[PDB]
């Protein structure tokens, strides 16, 4: 997260290499967001 | 003459329309539109449900101008029930209905430009449309289909700090409107494209059922906002746009003047916002708040009956034509005295427009007829119902 870009750009995430027995090095999909961070990543709140 | 079907799948028919054209050459003789490719039976399906269950049809009928149609349907239901909205909610009605006016005119200028071939305001206006759909998702939680206007005023309040973001949108929207007006009105291609093509007389524009921007392109002064005062549109002062030569170019500049005038009324909507409440203070047409519901009793009784049965609506017929930015939108509700509507016809603006397209497309060709469906701005959910 930083500040000097526009909105939607300024909070983002680099995903894991693997989780839950599936290697997500190349096949990368947006359903592996944790639920405590899903509120933060879509800018529903300002605090981490 | 080839009996060419123009087909739904060709993207300048907006996905839906089967025109057939018995064309000799590319000079099209007659164009016979069989709409009905999106016929969903909304007027049959409205009757078997309650009124609050009949609300989110009007999110989806004119689907590029949503909150104008639920403003139309809820002003018909509130005129049936004789319930005045609260004035803070009425200013919410005119503010988000003019966000919806900016929405439909962005779609009109955009799909006119895509049907002619200017692919540039299919993305440039749509970035600011995404900025507006952030506000739609901020208020309701859906980007298109809000169902935020209820009978008895709007559903919830705004989230906090919204009006600063509406003001910071509106100060930056004017340069993009002037930018599209620089790119697409003073140019040579659109001036060669949109002069003395598709002219309708004012006699034909009255007798063909044309309304709204077709009548303003024909030059007569028939906005449904100042001539017929509904909601709180009588308090704001706007100029109306009128056409002179009667062609599709006059509809394009009346949409540009409607952009600037609706942004002016949005500026005075932000300047003249009153404090107040969001629903009416009547538990039999408005659902109560959750904090008074969890402690009070009659709030939960009326919550139960308004969310299962709905409003017991007194019988009679009303029809409240409001200014959709396509044109005339009004719903002819009849009520049996129960909580279901008996029937309604939903007034499509473009129904009589695409009925009268056979008059204005004579003596032209196929690029002129895709320019005239882009000009006339026909989306088909409200038309096929």
């Amino acid at each position: 997260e930083d500040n000097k870009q526009f909105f939607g750009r300024h909070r983002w995430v680099i995903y894991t290499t693997e989780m839950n027995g599936k290697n997500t090095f190349w096949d990368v999909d947006g359903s592996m967001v944790p639920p405590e961070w899903h509120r933060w990543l879509h800018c529903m709140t300002d605090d981490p | 003459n080839m009996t060419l079907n123009f087909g739904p799948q060709h993207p300048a028919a907006h996905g839906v329309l089967r025109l057939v054209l018995e064309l000799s050459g590319e000079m099209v003789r007659k164009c016979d539109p069989h709409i009905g490719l999106l016929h969903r039976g909304t007027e049959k399906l409205i009757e078997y449900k309650t009124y609050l269950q009949a609300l989110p049809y009007f999110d989806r009928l004119d689907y590029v101008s949503m909150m104008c149609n639920e403003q139309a349907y809820s002003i018909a239901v509130e005129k049936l029930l004789n319930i005045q909205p609260p004035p803070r909610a009425q200013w919410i009605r005119v503010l988000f209905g003019e966000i919806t006016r900016i929405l439909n005119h962005i779609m009109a200028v955009t799909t006119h430009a895509l049907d002619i071939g200017a692919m540039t305001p299919f993305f440039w206006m749509f970035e600011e449309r995404e900025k507006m759909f952030e506000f739609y998702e901020r208020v309701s939680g859906a980007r298109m289909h809000a169902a935020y206007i209820r009978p008895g005023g709007v559903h919830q309040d705004l989230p906090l700090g919204l009006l600063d973001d509406i003001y910071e949108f509106s100060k930056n929207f004017s340069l993009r409107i002037d930018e599209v007006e620089e790119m697409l009105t003073n140019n040579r291609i659109w001036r060669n494209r949109t002069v003395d093509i598709g002219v309708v007389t004012a006699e034909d524009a009255l007798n063909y059922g044309f309304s709204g921007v077709m009548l303003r392109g024909s030059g007569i002064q028939w906005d449904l906002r100042k001539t017929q005062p509904y909601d709180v549109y009588d308090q704001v002062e706007f100029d109306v746009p009128i056409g002179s030569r009667g062609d599709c170019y006059d509809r394009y500049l009346c949409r540009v003047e409607e952009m600037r005038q609706s942004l002016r009324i949005i500026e005075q909507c932000l300047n003249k916002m009153p404090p107040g409440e969001i629903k009416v203070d009547d538990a039999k047409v408005s659902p109560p708040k959750r904090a008074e519901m969890k402690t009070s009793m009659e709030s939960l009784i009326h919550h139960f009956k308004l969310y299962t049965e709905g409003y017991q609506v007194p019988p009679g017929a009303t029809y409240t034509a409001i200014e959709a930015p396509k044109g005339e939108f009004g719903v002819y509700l009849v009520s049996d005295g129960s909580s279901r509507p008996y029937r309604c016809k939903i007034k499509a603006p473009g129904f009589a427009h695409l009925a009268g397209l056979d008059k204005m497309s004579k003596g032209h060709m196929l690029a002129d007829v895709v320019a005239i469906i882009g000009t006339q701005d026909i989306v088909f959910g409200e038309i096929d119902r």
């Binding site: 500040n3 000097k4 870009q5 526009f6 909105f7 800018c43 529903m44 709140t45 300002d46 605090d47 | 029930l81 004789n82 319930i83 005045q84 609260p86 970035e127 600011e128 900025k131 309040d157 989230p159 906090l160 700090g161 919204l162 600063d164 973001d165 910071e168 100060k171 930056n172 340069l175 993009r176 002037d178 930018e179 404090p275 107040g276 409440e277 969001i278 629903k279 009416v280 203070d281 009547d282 039999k284 047409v285 708040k289 008074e292 017991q312 007194p314 019988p315 009679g316």
Partner: protein, 70 residues
């Protein structure tokens, strides 16, 4: 967040102040972690004179008057 040479290039291309009024929201968004807003009550959340028969908008309508014929 552009530099001055390309900013003056698009100001030469426009004549307008795009740097002052960009189309992309940088820091004009209000803070999404907000205080909880206490919504006001309406004009008839009063315990006295709360009679529904005076404010009754759904019973004040009349069946429509046949004026002239039959």
């Amino acid at each position: 967040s552009a530099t001055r040479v390309i900013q003056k290039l698009r100001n030469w291309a426009s004549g307008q102040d795009l740097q002052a009024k960009l189309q992309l929201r940088y820091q004009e968004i209000a803070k999404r972690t907000q205080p909880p807003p206490k919504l006001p009550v309406g004009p008839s959340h009063k315990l006295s004179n709360n009679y529904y028969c005076t404010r009754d908008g759904r019973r004040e309508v009349v069946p429509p008057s046949i004026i002239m014929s039959s």
